[PDB]
Amino acid sequence: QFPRQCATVEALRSGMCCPDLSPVSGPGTDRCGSSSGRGRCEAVTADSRPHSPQYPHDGRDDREVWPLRFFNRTCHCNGNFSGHNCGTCRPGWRGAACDQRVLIVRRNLLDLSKEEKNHFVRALDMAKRTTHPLFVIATRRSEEILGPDGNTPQFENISIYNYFVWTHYYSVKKTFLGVGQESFGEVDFSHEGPAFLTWHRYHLLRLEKDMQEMLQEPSFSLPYWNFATGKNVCDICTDDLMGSRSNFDSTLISPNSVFSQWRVVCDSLEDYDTLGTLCNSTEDGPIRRNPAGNVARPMVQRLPEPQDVAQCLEVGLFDTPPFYSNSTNSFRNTVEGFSDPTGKYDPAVSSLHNLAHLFLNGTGGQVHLSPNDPIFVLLHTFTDAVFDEWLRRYNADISTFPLENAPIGHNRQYNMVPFWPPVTNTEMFVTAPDNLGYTYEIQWPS
Numbered sequence: 001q002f003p004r005q006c007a008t009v010e011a012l013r014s015g016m017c018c019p020d021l022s023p024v025s026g027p028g029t030d031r032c033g034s035s036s037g038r039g040r041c042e043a044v045t046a047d048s049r050p051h052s053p054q055y056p057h058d059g060r061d062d063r064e065v066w067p068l069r070f071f072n073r074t075c076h077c078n079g080n081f082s083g084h085n086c087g088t089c090r091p092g093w094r095g096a097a098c099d100q101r102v103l104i105v106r107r108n109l110l111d112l113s114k115e116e117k118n119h120f121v122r123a124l125d126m127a128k129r130t131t132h133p134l135f136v137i138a139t140r141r142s143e144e145i146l147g148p149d150g151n152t153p154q155f156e157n158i159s160i161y162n163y164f165v166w167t168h169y170y171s172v173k174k175t176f177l178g179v180g181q182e183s184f185g186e187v188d189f190s191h192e193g194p195a196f197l198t199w200h201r202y203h204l205l206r207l208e209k210d211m212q213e214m215l216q217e218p219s220f221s222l223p224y225w226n227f228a229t230g231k232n233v234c235d236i237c238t239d240d241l242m243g244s245r246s247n248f249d250s251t252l253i254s255p256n257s258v259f260s261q262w263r264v265v266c267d268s269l270e271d272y273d274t275l276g277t278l279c280n281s282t283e284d285g286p287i288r289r290n291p292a293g294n295v296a297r298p299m300v301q302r303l304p305e306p307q308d309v310a311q312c313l314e315v316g317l318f319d320t321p322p323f324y325s326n327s328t329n330s331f332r333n334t335v336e337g338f339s340d341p342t343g344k345y346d347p348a349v350s351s352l353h354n355l356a357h358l359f360l361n362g363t364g365g366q367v368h369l370s371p372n373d374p375i376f377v378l379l380h381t382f383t384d385a386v387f388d389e390w391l392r393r394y395n396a397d398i399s400t401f402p403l404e405n406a407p408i409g410h411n412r413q414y415n416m417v418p419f420w421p422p423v424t425n426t427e428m429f430v431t432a433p434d435n436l437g438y439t440y441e442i443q444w445p446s
C-alpha cells in the first residue's frame with residue numbers, strides 16, 4: 001500500500017509516487033535517490049494483456065492494472081538498490097552500496113531452541129503492536145480517497161502485522177458495484193491462479209524485512225510449520241509458541257499465550273460489501289481457532305500426509321489451462337490444494353495448503369481473515385519451501401506461467417496487488433538462495 005509521504009492530496013493529484021530520499025536543496029530534489037546513483041522517477045509498467053472472461057467489470061475496480069488507478073510514475077531503482085524511494089537494497093543485499101550479500105535460513109519452528117522460540121513469539125507480538133514506519137492503508141476506494149471535503153486523505157496508520165493482514169484482505173475483497181448492488185466475488189488477485197505462490201512469497205518476504213528493521217536484526221528469519229505430517233492435532237499449538245486451546249472456550253486460544261490477546265482486523269465484510277468502504281485499522285474480536293474441530297466436514301479434520309508433499313513435487317509444469325482452481329496436473333493448483341497430490345482435479349477434495357487452512361476451523365480458515373491467525377505465517381513459509389524446492393528441481397521454468405488469459409491479477413507481468421513498490425510475479429519466480437537472500441533448512445520425503 002502506499003508510502004505515507006505519497007498518501008497525500010498532492011501526490012494523488014500529480015499521479016506521482018516518487019518520494020525524496022533525503023534531499024540537499026529543498027523538497028523534491030532527491031526523488032528516488034537521483035542525486036546519488038540510486039534510482040529515478042519513471043513511468044510505471046503495468047500489465048496490459050487480456051485476462052480470463054470470468055471478470056466482467058473492467059473499469060470498476062482499483063485493483064485493475066495495478067497501480068495505474070492511483071499512480072502512473074514510481075521509483076525505479078538502479079542496480080541492486082531497491083525500496084519505495086530507492087533507499088534500501090534488493091533481497092539478498094545490504095550495505096550503503098548494496099554490495100554485501102546476506103543469506104538467512106528459514107528453519108522448522110520445532111527445531112528452534114527454547115530462547116529462539118520465545119524470541120520468535122515476542123517478535124510477532126511486537127509486530128502486532130508496532131506501527132508500520134512506511135506504509136499507511138486506504139479506508140476508502142479511489143473515488144472517496146481524498147475524503148468528504150476532497151482534501152483529507154482517507155488513510156490510517158497500521159501495525160506491521162496488521163499491514164500483512166490488510167494486504168491479503170485487499171487482494172481477496174469483492175469488487176464493489178454500488179450501494180444496493182451485490183458485490184462481485186468471482187475475483188481473487190492472490191488465489192486460484194498462477195500468482196498464488198509468488199504473491200504469498202512476496203507477502204512473507206515483506207513481513208520478514210519489516211520485522212528485521214523492527215528488531216534491528218538483519219538475520220532474523222521466519223520459521224516454518226511442516227503441516228504435512230498426517231496428524232490429528234496442530235503440533236505447534238502449544239503455549240510456548242502459537243498457543244494451545246483454551247480450557248474455557250474450545251474456540252479461543254489459551255490465556256497463557258500472548259496470541260489470546262490479539263484482536264483481528266477486517267472482520268466487517270457486511271460493512272465493506274454494502275457501503276463500499278475498506279478494512280481499516282480498528283481491531284475487533286479475538287482469534288478463533290479449533291484444530292480438527294470441523295465435525296461437519298470430516299475431510300478437513302486431518303492434515304496432509306507426508307507423501308502428499310512428495311507427490312505434488314513430481315508435477316513438473318508450474319500451471320496448466322485454464323490457470324484456475326480447476327486446472328489438472330498443475331503444480332500451482334496441487335500445492336495450493338484444489339487438486340489431489342497427483343494433479344487430478346476434484347471439486348470435493350481439499351489438500352495441502354487449502355487443507356491446512358481448513359484444518360484450523362476458525363479465523364485461519366476464512367479467506368478474508370486468515371492472516372489474523374499467526375499460524376498463517378508458518379503455514380505459508382512451508383508452502384513457500386515446497387515452491388522453492390520445485391523451483392530448484394525444474395530449473396525455475398516460468399514458461400507455463402501464462403502471460404495472457406489468466407484470471408485478473410494473475411497474468412505473469414501483473415504487479416502483485418497491492419504491494420509497493422510495484423513488483424511482478426516474474427520477480428518472485430526465482431530460486432530463493434541465489435536471488436532473494438534466503439533458503440530453507442528442510443528435508444524432503446523420499
Ligand SMILES: *[C@@H]1O[C@H](CO[C@@H]2O[C@@H](C)[C@@H](O)[C@@H](O)[C@@H]2O)[C@@H](O[C@@H]2O[C@H](CO)[C@@H](O)[C@H](O)[C@H]2NC(C)=O)[C@H](O)[C@H]1NC(C)=O
Nearest residue numbers: 011012013014015016043067068069070071072073142143
Ligand atoms: C499521469 O497522471 C496524471 C495525474 O492524474 C492522476 O492520475 C491517475 C491516478 C488518475 O486517477 C487521475 O484521475 C489522476 O488525476 C495525469 O494528468 C491528469 O490527466 C487527467 C485526465 O484523465 C486530467 O483530467 C487531469 O487534469 C490531469 N492532471 C494533471 C496534474 O496533469 C496524466 O495524464 C497521467 N499521465 C499518463 C497517464 O501518461
Ligand SMILES: *[C@@H]1O[C@H](CO)[C@@H](O[C@@H]2O[C@H](CO)[C@@H](O)[C@H](O)[C@H]2NC(C)=O)[C@H](O)[C@H]1NC(C)=O
Nearest residue numbers: 139267268269271272277278279280281282284
Ligand atoms: C472502520 O471499520 C468499522 C467496521 O466497518 C467501522 O465501524 C462500523 O460502522 C458502521 C457504519 O458507520 C456501523 O453501522 C457499524 O456498527 C460499525 N462497526 C463497528 C464494529 O463499530 C468504522 O466506522 C470504520 N472507521 C472508519 C474511520 O471508517
Ligand SMILES: *[C@@H]1O[C@H](CO)[C@@H](O[C@@H]2O[C@H](CO)[C@@H](O)[C@H](O)[C@H]2NC(C)=O)[C@H](O)[C@H]1NC(C)=O
Nearest residue numbers: 290293294295296297358360361362363365366
Ligand atoms: C468450524 O467447524 C464447524 C463444524 O464442526 C462449523 O460449524 C458448522 O457449520 C456448518 C456450515 O454452516 C453447519 O451446517 C453446522 O450446523 C455447523 N455446526 C456447528 C456445530 O456449529 C463452523 O462453521 C466451522 N468454522 C469455520 C470458520 O470453518
Ligand SMILES: *[C@@H]1O[C@H](CO[C@@H]2O[C@@H](C)[C@@H](O)[C@@H](O)[C@@H]2O)[C@@H](O)[C@H](O)[C@H]1NC(C)=O
Nearest residue numbers: 004007131132133134136153155156157158
Ligand atoms: C500516523 O501516525 C503518525 C506517526 O508517525 C510516526 O510513525 C511511527 C514510525 C511511530 O514511531 C510514530 O510514533 C511516529 O510519530 C502521526 O503523525 C499521524 O497521526 C498518523 N498519520 C496519518 C496519515 O494517519
Ligand SMILES: *[C@@H]1O[C@H](CO)[C@@H](O)[C@H](O)[C@H]1NC(C)=O
Nearest residue numbers: 054321322324325326327328
Ligand atoms: C473451470 O471453471 C471455469 C469457470 O466457471 C469454467 O468455465 C471452465 O469450463 C472450467 N474448466 C473445467 C471444468 O475443466
Ligand SMILES: O=c1cccccc1O
Nearest residue numbers: 354357364365366367370
Ligand atoms: O488460501 C486460503 C484457503 C482456504 C481458506 C481460508 C483462507 C485462505 O487464504
Ligand SMILES: [Zn+2]
Nearest residue numbers: 168190191200
Ligand atoms: Zn492466502
Ligand SMILES: [Zn+2]
Nearest residue numbers: 353357370380
Ligand atoms: Zn493461504
